[PDB]
Amino acid sequence: MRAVLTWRDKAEHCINDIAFKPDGTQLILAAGSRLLVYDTSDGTLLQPLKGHKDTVYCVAYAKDGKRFASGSADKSVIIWTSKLEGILKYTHNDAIQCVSYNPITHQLASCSSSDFGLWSPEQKSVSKHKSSSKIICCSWTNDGQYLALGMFNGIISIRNKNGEEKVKIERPGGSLSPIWSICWNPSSRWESFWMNREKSAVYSSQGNLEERNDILAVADWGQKVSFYQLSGKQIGKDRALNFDPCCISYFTKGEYILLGGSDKQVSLFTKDGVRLGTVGEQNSWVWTCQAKPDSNYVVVGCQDGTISFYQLIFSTVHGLYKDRYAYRDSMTDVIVQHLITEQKVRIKCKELVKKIAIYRNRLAIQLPEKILIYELYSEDLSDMHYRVKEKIIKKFECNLLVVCANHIILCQEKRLQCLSFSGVKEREWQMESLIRYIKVIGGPPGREGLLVGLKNGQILKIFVDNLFAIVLLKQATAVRCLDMSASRKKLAVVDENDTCLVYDIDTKELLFQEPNANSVAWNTQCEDMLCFSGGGYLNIKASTFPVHRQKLQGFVVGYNGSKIFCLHVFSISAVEVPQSAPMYQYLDRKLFKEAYQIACLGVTDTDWRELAMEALEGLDFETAKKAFIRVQDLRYLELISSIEERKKRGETNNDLFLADVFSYQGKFHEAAKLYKRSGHENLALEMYTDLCMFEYAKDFLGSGDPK
């Protein structure tokens, strides 16, 4: 989690309420006696609307982007329209506490200290209904059928569109816990209802619930947040708070909750109420904590008059080991996805997952107060039944988390610490400058290897069972995204200049450099293959050859067999590597065994035939046999068998074989030249007489006329 302050601007009075234009273009405040209209993109104040005569307490758009109401302490409500002109007005007997718009029917509901009034757009008068006590909150249901009124008595009256009190929810404590904020869960099918949108005249005044799955979040002044169903039954227990809440809201799809108030800060919560983190730290009470209608942006208005516009950023927390990929879903769950069978598995942690480390039959999840260690037990390659192995209960501070069979590794500054699964600390390594990267490179269960890179530029290998770091390299610039070849014979480094340097780990010599790399992955199955993404383009290298770059959205997480695995916005994706390009690159260099190794990863049959024929012309009969077998051409297989047995019996001329291959493909001319060069014009004559090309046989009548 991380929130960046896009813009902050201070008014001259407490910010009472805020409202967003549904398009998100502009927002509206309620500061003192005027309505400030701000541009969401920048924060430049457009217009102070000057309709009311006293303090403005509330404001709300109509979910249609055509009108918005505002009630004030002057005991009046003014309905403005877009383009910011006041077109309608009416009055109450008291200061208007809050006003809201029906999400579907645009039926305005404005409450006050004594009564609440409903007004349809086509209605010619305001229907006033008396209330038990002072109302402070309005919350229309998503379908627009019910209205929840939170009151100063610690009571919520849920009423229909007419005003009849359908149900009454009594928060414990009565007047001990005034109800200061409420909000319906906005996650329903009706959320998409209005996503396809396209002289002040005073108005007179005229004085089942069981099968529905609706959640009302309630922010009391007994310092608790409750969640109530439409039937009055509560959902779960309360969430004890140490501050008076003043604003409870939701994101666009109702996945997270925003809570502010007596604490001079704003907090993000799960939809269940588990605290996730801090959005902003303010200097006064946050009186409103709304969020942008369709983005991660949030806007916070406090009593000091400050308005702050944060952009919430969620960090990708994930691990990958070969064919398994665990990531953080919904900020509290861990999803382990198989990269072959695509059988996802969800693990509920009920707490903010901080770090994830995955390994063969091991899954470490660093919860804010503990680390959960999960294991696989069935001996199946596709087993996906993770059970809890251990719970290391300790408030951990670590830069990186890694997990090995029977061990856990914590990276913290220059300290690389090795703990058991029961929390016991076994070993500790002190590093040179600062650990930037760490990765398990396999090994025996309790004796595994670790590949460490430092901001010093130095790259080390640390074995869990011994207390000494083996120096692999001392680079020039810092290290990032280390990876090691499948055979542990080659290393690949990214060094803060996007320059992928590949080193021969045993001779300390580098092999090549590439100028744009943000992520590197060696093929776990083909040693020569390399992948690296940087600058929005994929790259696939075969040995020391040119690249075959694509466009890409995201960064490379893995490269297994013939599939790249890239992450784009918490979404994994598989790119199918074109094996034919490295195959033909190896072929042009007359490297047939390596071309076959690349082809075995999967190509078409035309490519297989092309490799077979190029091997034949190149006189590599083993690779030619294998490729032809994968095409199953008995003609060419029997030709190669005949050539092999002729070679076995003693024939050791490498031009007769090429002449035969050319004659057998159908050249009939280069084959004749090869036949003559190898000292056999008789074979060329036989070829031309068999083909009945007698005009060419005259050329190869070299012997003369001895019959």
Place this chain on the structure above:
Amino acid sequence: MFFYLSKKISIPNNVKLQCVSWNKEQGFIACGGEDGLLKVLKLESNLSMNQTLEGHSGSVQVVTWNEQYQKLTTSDENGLIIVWMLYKGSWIEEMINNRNKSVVRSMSWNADGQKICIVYEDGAVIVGSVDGNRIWGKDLKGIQLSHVTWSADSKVLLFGMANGEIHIYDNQGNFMIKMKLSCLVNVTGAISIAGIHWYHGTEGYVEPDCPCLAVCFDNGRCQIMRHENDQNPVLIDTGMYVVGIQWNHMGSVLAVAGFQKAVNIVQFYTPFGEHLGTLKVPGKEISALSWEGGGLKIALAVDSFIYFANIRPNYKWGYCSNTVVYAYTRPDRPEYCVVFWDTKNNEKYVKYVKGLISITTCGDFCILATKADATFVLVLCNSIGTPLDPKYIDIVPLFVAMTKTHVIAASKEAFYTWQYRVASRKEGRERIYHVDDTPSGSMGVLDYSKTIQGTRDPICAITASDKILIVGRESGTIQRYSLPNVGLIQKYSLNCRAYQLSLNCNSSRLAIIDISGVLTFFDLDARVTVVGELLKLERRDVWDMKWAKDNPDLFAMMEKTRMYVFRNLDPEEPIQTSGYICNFEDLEIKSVLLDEILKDPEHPNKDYLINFEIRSLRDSRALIEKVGIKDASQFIEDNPHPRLWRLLAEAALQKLDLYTAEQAFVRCKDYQGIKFVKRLGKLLSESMKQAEVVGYFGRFEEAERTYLEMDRRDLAIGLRLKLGDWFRVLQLLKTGSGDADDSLLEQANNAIGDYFADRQKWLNAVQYYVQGRNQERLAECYYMLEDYEGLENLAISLPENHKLLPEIAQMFVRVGMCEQAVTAFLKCSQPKAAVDTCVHLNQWNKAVELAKNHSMKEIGSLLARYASHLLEKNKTLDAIELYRKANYFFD
């Protein structure tokens, strides 16, 4: 997207029909009569011609199938609702209901069939479950209803007033906002709906957020809107009293049935509002539409007749190498599923593609024209689906024409040429031309300012041969450019608007199928005094065509349900088939039944691939059958062609003439065949030659069985060994005896180990390499499997010296097993490395001990300076630890 009337069913006694409902899952057609008549029918001509006359006096107005649970429901003008179930192959009334107030205006089942809403004229609404009143029967208000429809999730339930207002409801009598009608703005008089259809996505959506719901009014204007829209595809029709609306089964075509003032019409539209044609039904007046389950046939009620129209949709298919590519949408995933069904190996390759504007094929390649999140993509793919090259272009790839070494993607106002191959890889020369640019012989590179000028004569179709590029425009004008370097050579200005274009191999003539399906021929080079001329071969209902890759004169076409083949404007006998020409080559036509495949897209049978032989090949084969080889050979020599020569040679080989076969191989210039026949003649036994020839044609199992039956396990083994069937070699070696079976079985086991290891399938190759005796590869399998215990066992099982032990010790050093590496090196007799690894792995005790044993004594300085460096780092404790490990206890 073509359409033609195909059948007719005259209802007896000339009663008027007021409703046709084609059951989608089962091919049942329910027809409502004007005098109490109600009939259930089924095709394949009728199979289940039924007269469900139980009840239903007066007239019959509404008819709805329940799909799941297969329950028909029918209503009178007297309000008698009857629900019918299929019992004992006949339809019997199951439920009967009668509300005695008004007439049922409409009925509709839920998206899952568990709930039904019926709307009356007096405003009463009755909603029932499959058995009884589910929730409510509401009396509503002073309104007259005409329609009813559920949503995808069955939550909203939108009605239609008699005065022309659609009201959105709650799944109860709770009135939500009235719908905002955007299609009618300038209308003035009274408006009635007459047609509402919501495509409950059940075969996927053509676009991830395509318009689904569709409303039309009797005046003629329609809006295709998603949920409750405010801006939405608007359409204007000349349909006076539009009679009906029907979505396709995939929701990709909308059929609007009405009649202009002028006469009956069934127009077709795309979900985004693009027009597609007009059917021009005979008779007095239409009454209802109903698509088939597969959307291929549409039944429409005209007077006392049920006219059937056959429909050819726009399938996204292609043929590359031996692979049929075909794309379809599915409910679960929001992107197109494209199957690269390789017919040669009966393999499938499912890809998932987001945009997928088009699929085009040429040679062993396939261009998928797609829309990305450099806004549009052209993915160049292999025949097995692997994307070789995604090329990002900006203009819309509305029309894609793919020649080998060129790809032309044309929008309505420009075309883009990209060379993707060389006659052999990417030599990209990307160019963009506006249609009215008249490019010169050659040239600006990637100048995209030409795609925004706009034109009054848009592009309708494009094609490109190896030499020329033909752009068809909406006025009938075609423009011809030189393809390798685009330059405007000629303009022709044909008669009718072009839909499909094709060029023969000579690029000398062009076959044009217009929008109405009429096929004509243009001769580009035939100069009359003008430049090009027509050819007077107008056909009527053509919907597919293909030239030969070999013969300029040879042509193939599909008209309605028959395939015709033309040799220079001379048609042959038709072939009753419904398929798409995958290939026309070597007197052979390969076609596929996409209509059958796309009904079961998961499992395409090989029975759907049909091969035809044109008159020449069929005649030669039949003459070979009737008279002996000797005379058919003379006939084929009179009319020579390489395909016929190869057929004659293979027939002779089957008969084992070995003389006619050799001559016919000479005719084909087939040296492989000549050599094979010479080798076969050198062989001196029948049933040896028969085995050889049955191996020649690829009947490997037949050849193996033949060799076994003649008591030759040797030659069966040899045949299996020339091929790669090593499992077959193991199976055969299990029985009988051989000259050298231990070596043969070891070779088989090593080869299977290689077979599994080349596919990265260790723990299967490890099973072999052990029954066989392979060491070099077995160590690699253990290493990649990280079975270091196996590596240790292998290293201790090897002899004292070996070429593999040093490699094993290096592997051990890399993984970090000092002890096993030291033992392996000492087995190699390389103590120097055995101590260098102890130093490297910081096992100084072993290093000093081995120095004392093997007399190196150079590690004292190593320890001294290592400890000096450690002390320089203030790690005195580490120095003490090493000095204790190295037994330098004094220090």
Place this chain on the structure above:
Amino acid sequence: EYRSKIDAKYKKKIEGMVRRPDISEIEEATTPCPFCKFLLPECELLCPGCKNSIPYCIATGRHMLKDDWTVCPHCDFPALYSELKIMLNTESTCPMCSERLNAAQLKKISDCTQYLRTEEEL
């Protein structure tokens, strides 16, 4: 599996040959097939030319030859006339039938088509 089973007299020899490999091997001579006159190794019995199994000389085990053909008068098994004659100098019985066989009983056969007839067509 076969380790720790070589005769103690020969373990030294076996380990000596393996430790210093000697790939030096004299090539086996090639002789014609009796059916198609194809040159194949003397000890190879399946001819790659005619795909026919070749009878083996009961004296040497080599495949039979047309120009050195003979048969034991007792067991009617093929044999190489020169090779059988040379081997009979030190053995007084047929190697195959274990019957009393002298050198004089061998008659060189010129027409061996009786023994070269394929069983399928005969």
